[PDB]
Design a binder for this molecule. Structure first.
Ligand code: NA
Ligand code: NA
Lengths: 236, 229
């Protein structure tokens, strides 16, 4: 990603260093009175909301490169009581305080625009997710996430398009789709297996009917088409 | 809202003037090859999409002041095949081309931040709406959504929190399963009709089932939030 690399160089130029986080660590948390701008350069994370009764809600998933900000750029106050938890084994992020961000993005407008469009990708992603769910329910959400994962991490193998992710637990799949119950997800994931849309052969998932996923996750497909056309065109 | 006034003054002081749109008109549409930055100064609108059936899908509602951009600021291409339809009888909006927008934001970064932070609020709104739905399903979405409408348009009266909105625009804003959830709220005296108006009489019920959108409004609009808490 060119825009993400040039932004990386820009941060290091201005002294900001990368920080290594291991699985289950929180890059930022919902109790910190200080808010940050996280430039997730490598790895996978998820946005959570730990309610008072201890229940963890999974709201969004991110992979580097991307930008996740915990506070409003103007007021510097919380946009929501969320945490950014690492779910890959390791992750690499640049932690920035918001006040420092405004200064940096004011010296270079090109990178300001890079951060600006990451928020736009978020807005349209959520709506797209909500669109597919409204049409095809949980099936649309699951097919949508699997499709996106196939665009990003898919590779050609004799047994279909292999999703090249370590520890892609079937429960990790049911959260980005918007389901907290492992049984209701197990139902759809099994049906997909029975209809041979996917196959779990040795460690990883294999997509076999890619057209099937495009059929029930159309708006998330149109989102990836409009947002990442180069990667989209690899399997279209 | 002072932040929007300065932006208006800023847009006008640089020549950009507003247009007037009318109910059922599209400020932008999913077929135009040119993308725009809409500065919705007044009125109420909805974002719509269309699947390959001719079906209309209501995705999002916006009230002025606010900003709705149809294309990415860097590439200027679509973010999604969306239309911006006017819900209110009339609406006032400034229609800017993304290319023209940039050179404008580049010369007064204070108003760039206003637009930036406006995307932040839209992002957080979607997550809170999704959070409530994941906890209380359609019930949680309806409540959350009525809760915000109460915070924005409500005023305390002897009959409760009156929604100072056209009874027309109200019904335009309120599917069979949804119609029965709303009517059940009416039947249970959460929101009540009286004297040609609607009043919210059990605000706590809405807060109870729209908690994460209730926090969103407190974090995004703490001024208005305090008027009723
Ligand atoms: Na925080
Ligand atoms: Na458009």
């Amino acid at each position: 990603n060119a825009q993400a690399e040039e932004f990386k160089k820009y941060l290091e130029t201005n002294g900001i260093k990368p920080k290594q986080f291991h699985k289950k660590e929180l890059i930022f948390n919902q109790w910190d009175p200080q808010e940050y701008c996280i430039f997730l350069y490598d790895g996978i994370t998820k946005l959570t909301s730990i309610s008072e009764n201890g229940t963890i809600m999974n709201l969004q998933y991110y992979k580097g490169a991307f930008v996740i900000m915990s506070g409003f750029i103007d007021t510097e106050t919380s946009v929501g009581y969320y945490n950014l938890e690492v779910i890959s084994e390791q992750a690499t992020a640049y932690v920035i305080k918001i006040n420092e961000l405004k200064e940096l993005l004011s010296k270079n407008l090109t990178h300001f625009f890079y951060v600006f469009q990451t928020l736009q990708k978020q807005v349209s992603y959520s709506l797209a997710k909500f669109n597919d769910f409204s049409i095809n329910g949980k099936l649309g959400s699951i097919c949508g996430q699997l499709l996106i994962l196939t665009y990003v991490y898919g590779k050609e193998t004799p047994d279909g398009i292999k999703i090249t992710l370590d520890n892609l637990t079937m429960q990790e799949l049911g959260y980005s789709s918007g389901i907290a119950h492992s049984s209701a997800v197990s139902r759809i994931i099994s049906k997909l297996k029975q209809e041979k849309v996917i196959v779990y052969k040795n460690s990883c998932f294999y997509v076999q009917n890619l057209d099937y996923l495009k059929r029930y996750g159309p708006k998330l497909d149109e989102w990836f088409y409009l947002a990442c056309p180069a990667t989209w065109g690899k399997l279209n």
